[PDB]
Amino acid sequence: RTYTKVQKTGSVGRSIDVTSFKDYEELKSAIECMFGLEGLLTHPQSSGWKLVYVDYESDVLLVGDDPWEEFVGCVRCIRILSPTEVQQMSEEGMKLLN
Amino acid sequence: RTYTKVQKTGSVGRSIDVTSFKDYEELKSAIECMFGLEGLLTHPQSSGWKLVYVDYESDVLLVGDDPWEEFVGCVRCIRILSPTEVQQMSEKLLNSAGI
């Protein structure tokens, strides 16, 4: 498997060549157009939506933080989290702790 | 690997350039903003929140004891520990290996 999975709960998932996009602006925009989320993954100051990824160590990390070259190497799969899923994640951490 | 992971249970992880900070006060403030914990890791006495890290030798250690220069090259990842997670760390493997 050369292609990376892009998933959104309730949508049919997709597979992309992350490396073919050469930056996060290009990546994020393409993903927003694919799932009909125009402006939501490219505005952290207004939107509660997160574009996350699972890496080689199975860690859920936010897309954007790392140098692109590192990212392209670590990335195992991508997921779009809605403001609701982010709170569902928080509550599941509380379930884990209790 | 060049940036350091910052993690919190029930939260989406992050990655920071540890070197882009002059001191621990700066490191702690950035992490607090990123995870919405303003004043929890800086004043720990009244919070119980611990900012831990994993060094090159795979050891879990409290962030802030070592000279900043030393820390910078030893850190592998940072983890934010909530007061509950702290209590849970004591709990069972010693009784497993013993028996």
* B3 interface with A at CB cutoff 8 Å: yes
Separation CA B67–CA A92 (nearest Å) = 37
- Residue in A closest to B15 by C-alpha: A65
**Tokens 């569902």 belong to residue:** A88
Coil, strand, or helix at residue B23? coil
* B1 interface with A at CB cutoff 8 Å: yes
Structural domain total, chain A: 1
> Chain A, 47-66: which have a CB under 8 Å from a chain B CB?
50, 52, 59-62, 65-66
| Chain centre to alpha carbon of residue A85 | 12
Resolution limit in angstroms? 2.8
Parallel, antiparallel, or unpaired: how do β-strands A50-55 and B60-62 relate? unpaired
CATH number at residue B96: 3.10.20.90
Range of the domain at B80: 1-99
> Chain A, 76-95: which have a CB under 8 Å from a chain B CB?
81, 86, 89-94
CA separation (Å) from B80 to A9, A46, A70, B48, B94? 28, 26, 24, 11, 25
Q: Which residues have CB under 8 Å from A58's CB, separation 6+? A: A76
**Tokens 């994993």 belong to residue:** B54
What number of residues does chain B have?
Answer: 99
CA angle B24, B10, A29 (to 5 degrees): 90
